[PDB]
Design a protein around this ligand. Structure first.
Ligand code: NAG
Ligand code: NAG
Ligand code: NAG
Lengths: 164, 321, 321, 164, 321, 164
């Protein structure tokens, strides 16, 4: 991917996480688990939903072919009618197919982006107090109970806690 | 040693999408936006039934081809369905002036009311029940278009006709008439004593003069003669004037245009399914919330937007594996 | 302890833009690229005034409807403005052949020079000042189209006319003429002794023969009769030939086409504002440097490109907060 | 944003900076202040200006409707004329609206990108000699006077100066 | 001290591309996708040679203008090339009915076979070798269109013609004929004793009646008279019937339509290059694998898609320096 | 560039590398050299090739003008014919030019992206065992023979080897 996260430094996705698009797996003395990051997940949902509705709403006034009949001595204008309606049909078909391809790719790199920025969010917080394994995981130098984990999830992690 | 990980959703969905650089990319969530299904039936549109001409054309219907009695008194329609090549059209051969423009007029009409404007019984000095042909048989017997009358000579005389009709109704009136082009002079005198004839027709807008063409031609449905048909729209309070000394196929029934609105003339071989829909195509109806479809360009009703694609899938979720 | 920060501009601008994933995103800098304003006036285009027909049509102007004297001698125009439904058109009822094609011709013309090609005084053997009607009143008095002459019989005789006119000028010549279709035979002999008449017209290109249609019709502006008008473009050095034994509405004034160029026929109810502009629409003029506009499709002059949008704003700066 | 900088690790923008789109705030013994980064700002200006002119120049030959008149028996071709001109009107309207949406988003992610790359420019330079606070700010381990600050702004920072 | 670096390809290519934010960006690899070259020749299309009318028009060819003998017996063609303004057209002035619709028909035809349907020798009671004019000279001598015959009176009598022809072949038949519009009554009696004449023509589909227009007109190629030409397509097993008492320009040679298929009428001043190609334009042929071209819209054969660009280069590699 | 690599932290490209689009230069006691990274290079090739073929295949049904002739009294429909064919010509020209500009830019930022992700691939691996010079180069704290270099190129680098 463009941002290196999905199928990048993170090997694969989590079959385990079911309440969100991106999130955390934590492991401590109280146990292990998955949690979904609501802010980035929700914002992603709004992004893609609005993309779908924009794509749909921009093509609500396309081109409707109506039927015209011509006689045996109106072949020139009959051909004109046919060629014009085919023409419009073709510009609109092209537009639809193209838009879908483009915005599909934008969507994928958008999710990849969201993942990397989440990872950077935790990284920027833990600075010294954990080590980057290299695969999306941080190994703490201190004990991190559930409250500390949640403090990292909501963004309030109190760094003032040594680690050597 | 405690640890925290950042990750992303993955599932067992096999839904693929395509991008500009890669084809068939598996994703977690996807929205298909192209309707690709129809019921294969011709249906009412919002409760109002279409007009399904069978083996009749618009001309056979309007002029009243004896083989088209199914459509003598047609109720309000939503759209009109005609077959590609209707068998019952002009039973007596000839032509229909500005046929295509008239068919175009029908696109904006949803209801006719047939009215008798000049009764077959009002002709005192001409014969009015002898204009029949074996080219237009009804139940194995010579007949003719039902909405017009092929007037012929009475007692070896065809006095010049001066007939006028004032559209007193509040609706526009579709009025039809014709001229007979005979195959020879003997036929001309036999049918209409006078050798040299005309039909003049005048409204506030129309000013035309017809002369029949007496000539030898190849036979269509057994006739070397031709019938040529004409039409006009009489405005409310305008009169139509006919004058003729022969060859006049006079109107008897005309059509009040009591409903203007959206409509269409559909080319389809299908018949009437007993159903209802919001969107109709020549090959079947569409019940979809989808924005796009790939069934038929020529659509009527509240329809998705036609497109020539075989597949349109939008990615919403992310890359699977 | 010293520190360095990386940051970005922010301001108090409230200008919003829209993106594909988010609507109404506030930004620091933005360029609107859609003109949405006009002056509500019809203006000269680069100093050259339009031709504003008032309650006259193109036909009333060209044929010289007595009610259209404002336009007897019209100077050079940029474009032509006609109302949706002009009241002064064909004062004596009838029709104008290929009217739409002629209006199309006017799109490419910016100046006529009226010239007398056959003087009303040159008719020795016919009457030339008696072709007037109460259908074309001037100041409460019977009159007629000013550019043609309704010739009538003199001393109970209408000798056949043979008249020819050679376009000696270096410009193309627009030439108009007409035929009278009377309501009855008595009227025919009364106006033009001869019962059976024709008008033949021939150029290097034109070869036509008109016969009047004597018939009873409903009255428009008090007349059951009709006037039918025809036109042609005489090439430099080609002659036009008329021959007729009745019913001939002869040309007197024709139109030299002295200026070809871009022009248009505008449908608008507005009148003349005393202004000047580079771009004109049927609802007002546009003075903009903008690339797009949403006012009217039918534009003339150096204009932005019409588009059906209500808002087109391009982001240039970055996201505010 | 796609690159995580604007409304990302950097909380908000600076009302204070007025001579550029991106830049620096510095604080030392000689004082504090804002400076604009000319290279990235100017390059951004060229980028967006050229985008505007490209968008404008690609639509200089659109479709001008002219007027055609038809009589009461030319309704088929009249309908054809109308339907065709509506058609073109609709393809062009669609194109304009679409282009604007797309390039607006590209513009926004372009500015976001510029910010992140500027931040990376300073980061890659200061390596050991300052600490990443996490919010776009670097706290020096050494004294950094105005000349040192400018040496970081123009890209010439002489790293050979210890910091433990 | 050991080290590892990440880097990217760079070369000495000077190929530039353009992006939405930057113009003339140098890259390592690039694909141009626009063909901009042609051979300047008119070539056979897949081995089948075009029909290159020289200074003849389609009308001069079909009617058999004496100056167009190069095209008396034309073999199978791929497309037809006509000059902008051919010099040899209607040698005797007049007109050709529905000329444009017929040219349109030729777009779908690749081969005619000329057949004699009514031999010049079969006329017993009329003269058939005296319908020649100095307007249609052959080798300095009065002549006429070769595919039709200008019949004239024999022994001061022009008996009415009744002639019929049944299309017995399995192909559609293109049939041409004409009427003479004389400049005066004396000419009428001199050529065709009868003062009042007609030509009637009838098929299963056609029912027309022509009357000549005797009138004075300006001279084209020395003639005030006009020839007016008509055509029809006789169906397999339908007959065509002619009846006339004067002014009849009768068919002698008609055209079997033995090859339908794609074709075109090209406007070009170029002549025949002795070459072969897959794609032809009015200004030269195209041998390209390219998807786009900028040479000419009006293309025939297996061609790239025309576009109004001067340059279309797609980046494939990366940014150079 | 959008991702900061090409003409970014890496100054210029390597004239020396000829077997790939992206890659490595290594220097050790056994010597120095260039190697191309096949996976990212090949994937890039597939990406751009498929882009070219998609761009081409989406425009295989454009609009072919045929010739129609009109007489001196068919000027309205003649003008209609001309205006319509010009119209289609213009929508298609616009589409082609636009598509080329857009996908050219996408291609460039795609290569830039590939470079940065390759760099991150090595970085995430060497963590402590080398230092980031800042210019795309890593200076090892340990000896890295050819086998170790290749272990970094194929992604299998065995980090368990101290470096202080
Ligand atoms: C039809 O009748 C109305 C009155 O009922 C009359 O005003 C009108 O003139 C008549 N129409 C014509 C044209 O004769
Ligand atoms: C008109 O006059 C010119 C000479 O002034 C002459 O050559 C030409 O033949 C005339 N036009 C016709 C068709 O009579
Ligand atoms: C032409 O000939 C065929 C038999 O060869 C006949 O059946 C047909 O009726 C003829 N065509 C006409 C219309 O006379």
């Amino acid at each position: 991917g463009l941002f290196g996260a999905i199928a990048g430094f993170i090997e694969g996705g989590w079959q385990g996480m079911v309440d969100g698009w991106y999130g955390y797996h934590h492991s401590n003395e109280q146990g292990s688990g998955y949690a979904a990051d609501k802010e980035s997940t929700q914002k992603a949902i709004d992004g893609v939903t609005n993309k779908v509705n924009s794509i749909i709403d921009k093509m609500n006034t396309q081109f409707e072919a109506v039927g015209r009949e011509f006689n045996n001595l109106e072949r020139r204008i009959e051909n004109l009618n046919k060629k014009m309606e085919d023409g419009f049909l073709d510009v609109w078909t092209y537009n639809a197919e193209l838009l879908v391809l483009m915005e599909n790719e934008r969507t994928l790199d958008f999710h990849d982006s969201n993942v990397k920025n989440l990872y950077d969010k935790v990284r920027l917080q833990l600075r010294d107090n954990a080590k980057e394994l290299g695969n999306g995981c941080f190994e703490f130098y201190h004990k991190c109970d559930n409250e500390c984990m949640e403090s990292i999830r909501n963004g309030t992690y109190n760094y003032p806690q040594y680690s050597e | 040693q405690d640890q925290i990980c950042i990750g992303y959703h993955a599932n067992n969905s096999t839904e693929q999408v395509d991008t500009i650089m890669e084809k068939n990319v598996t994703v977690t969530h996807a929205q298909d936006i192209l309707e690709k299904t129809h019921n294969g039936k011709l249906c009412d549109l919002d409760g109002v039934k279409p007009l399904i001409l069978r083996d009749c054309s618009v001309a056979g219907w309007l002029l009243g081809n004896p083989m088209c009695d199914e459509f003598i008194n047609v109720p309000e329609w939503s759209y009109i369905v005609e077959k590609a090549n209707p068998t019952n059209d002009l039973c007596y051969p000839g032509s229909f002036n500005d046929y295509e423009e008239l068919k175009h007029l029908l696109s904006r009409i949803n209801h006719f009311e047939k009215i008798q404007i000049i009764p077959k019984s009002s002709w005192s000095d001409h014969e009015a029940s002898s204009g029949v042909s074996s080219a237009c048989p009804y139940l194995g017997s010579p007949s003719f278009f039902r909405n017009v009358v092929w007037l012929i000579k009475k007692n070896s005389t065809y006095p010049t006709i001066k007939k006028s009709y004032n559209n007193t109704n509040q609706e526009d009136l579709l009025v039809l008439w014709g001229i007979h082009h005979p195959n020879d002079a003997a036929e001309q005198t036999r049918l209409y004593q006078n050798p040299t004839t005309y039909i003049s027709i005048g409204t506030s807008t129309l000013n035309q003069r017809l002369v029949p063409k007496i000539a030898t031609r190849s036979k269509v449905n057994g006739q070397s003669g031709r019938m040529e048909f004409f039409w006009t729209i009489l405005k409310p309070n305008d009169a139509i004037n006919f004058e003729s000394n022969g060859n006049f196929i006079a109107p008897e029934y005309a059509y009040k245009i009591v409903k203007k609105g959206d409509s269409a003339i559909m080319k389809s071989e299908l018949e009437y399914g007993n159903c209802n829909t919001k969107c109709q195509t020549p090959m079947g109806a569409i019940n979809s919330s989808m924005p796009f479809h790939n069934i038929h360009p020529l659509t009527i009703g509240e329809c998705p937007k036609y497109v020539k694609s075989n597949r349109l899938v939008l990615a919403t979720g992310l890359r699977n594996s």
